[PDB]
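Entry:
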Amino acid sequence: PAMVAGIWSQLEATNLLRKLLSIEQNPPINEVVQSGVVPRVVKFLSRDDFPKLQFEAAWALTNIASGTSENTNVIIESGAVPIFIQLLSSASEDVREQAVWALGNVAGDSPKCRDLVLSYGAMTPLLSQFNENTKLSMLRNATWTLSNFCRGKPPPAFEQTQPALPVLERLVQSMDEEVLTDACWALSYLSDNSNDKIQAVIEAGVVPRLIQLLGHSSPSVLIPALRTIGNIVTGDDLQTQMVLDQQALPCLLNLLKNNYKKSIKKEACWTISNITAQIQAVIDAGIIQSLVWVLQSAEFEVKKEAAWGISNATSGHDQIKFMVSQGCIKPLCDLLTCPDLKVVTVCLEALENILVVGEAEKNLGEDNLYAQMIDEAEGLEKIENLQSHDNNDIYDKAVKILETFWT
């Protein structure tokens, strides 16, 4: 409005500058760059002797880091990021926490910013920061900044984030919901797309704790923990087995059985489908009833995942007979009229696998029971209608099912 930048005690000015930037609506950031006093403020970061000015300066730049990637990039070009790194070793507790904050804002903005922060080796001082003497405010701030250090896609070089795993393992032991949430998010990022990464996460010994978090009374914690476990099962079988051996399935059942948040149910189904690829384990837990219940009653985003869970099991003989005895056919049949072609093909794949086992056990004088059951559930009509379908791939899949099991 009518500011005088008397920064050239000027702390008084730096405080106003900082407070102006921390305005909620229309923060006047770009006009601070017009005046061009950012390098002067960057010099104040290097004033260990006068930590109030240092604190108000760091805060003022943390605020500029918030928002858009530019004007975020001007803080990078000013050379403030390296200064924030060595501020993590300052004697002032308020400066250290502020330095942690600033680096979180920056790293979180983009993978380019993240990698830049990691290239300067911000990890090492950020970890030498968690201990018994660490307060709640610092504990929360640091775990969150760490969350952003691992966040983003493309992901950061695994081996840069790898030493976080030892610390993360301890952070999940906490009972603070803000710390637990971000820790699980951090872990969920470190398990995405690479069996090598998934293995490292298991070796840290976080799996048993994450199971307990599946029974947590707060979706903030429940979701990222459930996501991490979902990522662990997407890897190979020996990795998937480690979650099974930790009795994760009773916890997953609860999420389907009890009426949790719509999005949590669908994450649980997604996780179950990545197991069915060790199918024996899921059957013993009694998941199929609730999974069939979901496949009929629950809304489409969850049905889609349930369908995947069923089909993948039928891909991986005696087991299928139990699934049919749970009344899974009718559920699968009525989804053949679905608008989504991906789930229609998934259901065809499922019924085909069932019909194969139907023919198999028939040859042991009777008919194919499952083909009869499909016909009994109005399923044969729906399959015959797929011959008039737009998608050629579905016509083809529909025809080959008829020619093999109905002539």
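The chain has 28 helices and no strands.
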